[PDB]
Amino acid sequence: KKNIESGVAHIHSTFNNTIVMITDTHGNALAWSSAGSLGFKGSKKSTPFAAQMAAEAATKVAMEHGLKTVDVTVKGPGSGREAAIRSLQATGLEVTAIRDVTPVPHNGCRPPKRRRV
RNA sequence: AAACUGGGAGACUUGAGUGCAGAAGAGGAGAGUGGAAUUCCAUGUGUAGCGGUGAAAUGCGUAGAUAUAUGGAGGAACACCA
């Protein structure tokens, strides 16, 4: 439907999870996934393999509506950010841009206590 | 008695200040202003999780969360320079 054939992948990868949503060239979302929505639990949600299969479960649906063009904007200073890409290309999509979008404050707000573990 | 310390009348320019000619600086007080980010709000797309740990649970979520796009509101601190 809508035979968009263009869009941009958003990767949001923290220390203990990983989300990949694929939306079109502007806003409105088409298909998403995350490691939790694949039965994984707890620790394992941060290994790259989780990002592998989540990228797959998103692509497989995004190209069930016609899609080649995609870019990659990676938030999320975590680990599996590149495994997400390697699964994004090698199951059909047409990656052509990588960019980093990490919020960097110019010293505005105060962060929480340091943990004494 | 008259070297030294004290007192009295003077004299001097090296200490101390003044004039003239220049230099650097997150020194202080007042009044405006900028962008990055966090929170909340409004609206579109959007399906079942998100968040968190050494592992879990409490918490938020099908009164449509998280994500994602555009617009507003307020406060505090000023990345690189260093």
Residue numbers in the entry: 13 to 129
Give me lines lifted from the publication on this model:
Ribosomes are the ribonucleoprotein machines responsible for protein synthesis. Here, our goal was to investigate the structural conservation of the Enterococcus faecalis ribosome compared to Escherichia coli, a model organism for structure-based development of ribosome-targeting compounds. In the analysis of the E. faecalis 70S ribosome structure determined by cryo-electron microscopy (cryo-EM) to a global resolution of 2.8 Å, we find that structural differences are located predominantly in peripheral regions, while the organization of the functional centres and antibiotic binding sites remains conserved. The cryo-EM structure of E. faecalis 70S ribosome presented here revealed that the architecture of functional centres and subunit interfaces remain conserved when compared with E. coli and S. aureus.
Structure determination by cryo-EM using multi-body refinement produced molecular maps that reached 2.8 Å for the 50S subunit, 3.0 Å for the 30S body domain, and 3.2 Å for the 30S head domain by gold-standard Fourier shell correlation. These maps were used to generate models for the 30S head and body domain and the 50S subunit. In the 16S rRNA, larger structural variations are located in solvent-exposed and peripheral sections of the beak (rRNA helix h33a), the spur (h6) and the body (h7, h10 and h44). Gentamicin binds near A1492–A1493 in the 16S helix 44, restricting motions in the ribosomal decoding centre, which contributes to misreading and interferes with translocation and ribosome recycling. In Supplementary Fig. S8c, the superposed RNA backbones for the E. coli and E. faecalis structures are almost indistinguishable, indicating that antibiotic binding would occur in a similar fashion.
